[PDB]
């Protein structure tokens, strides 16, 4: 699911939003943890 | 002999998931690694004739 | 067929002794192999 904010360029509104569904993914595969990749 | 199948495994899988692994599986008390006393190859395949 | 022993008599039937018996090289099962009651085990060797 994801939501793009354009929306105060640091601080937060403490506004509200939903996420719409955005993708489906039939992997099937066990996930306990995860880590982000960065540049 | 080209069909593998799992006979043993640690605990039960969900739904719609799959298990491509190799990895040696413990049966008996004693530790062991590769194949051995209490240790077996998980998976087994039926020579279909 | 070694006399075909029925083991089931009847009692609680502990499977994992089978282990600390001998090194084994096979053990296939065609029901459960993490192992009920089977009301007669029928073993035989």
């Known amino acids: 699911y994801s939501k793009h904010t354009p ?3 640091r601080d937060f509104p403490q506004g509200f939003s939903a996420l719409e569904p955005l993708v489906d993914l039939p992997i099937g595969i066990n996930i306990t943890r995860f880590q982000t990749l960065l540049a | 002999y080209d ?11 969900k739904p719609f998931e799959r ?5 040696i599986y413990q049966a008996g ?3 062991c690694k ?3 006393p209490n ?5 087994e395949s039926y020579g279909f004739r | 067929y070694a006399w075909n022993r029925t083991r089931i008599s009847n009692c609680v039937a502990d499977y994992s002794v089978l282990y600390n018996f001998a090194p084994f ?4 099962c065609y029901g459960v192999s993490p192992t009920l009651c ?3 085990v029928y073993a035989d060797s």
């Not at chain 2, 069909?3 to 899988?13: A, E």
């Not at chain 2, 240790?39 to 998976?43: A, G, K, S, T």
């Open chain 2, 29 to 31: 008390n004693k530790p």
């Open chain 2, 34 to 36: 590769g194949k051995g």
């Open chain 3, 38 to 40: 089977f009301t007669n």
């Open chain 3, 25 to 28: 090289f096979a053990f296939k």
């Open chain 2, 19 to 23: 298990d491509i692994s190799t990895e």
């Open chain 1, 7 to 9: 929306i105060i360029g």
């Open chain 2, 3 to 13: 069909y593998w199948y799992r006979s043993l495994r640690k605990s039960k899988l």
């Open chain 2, 39 to 43: 240790c077996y190859f998980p998976l």
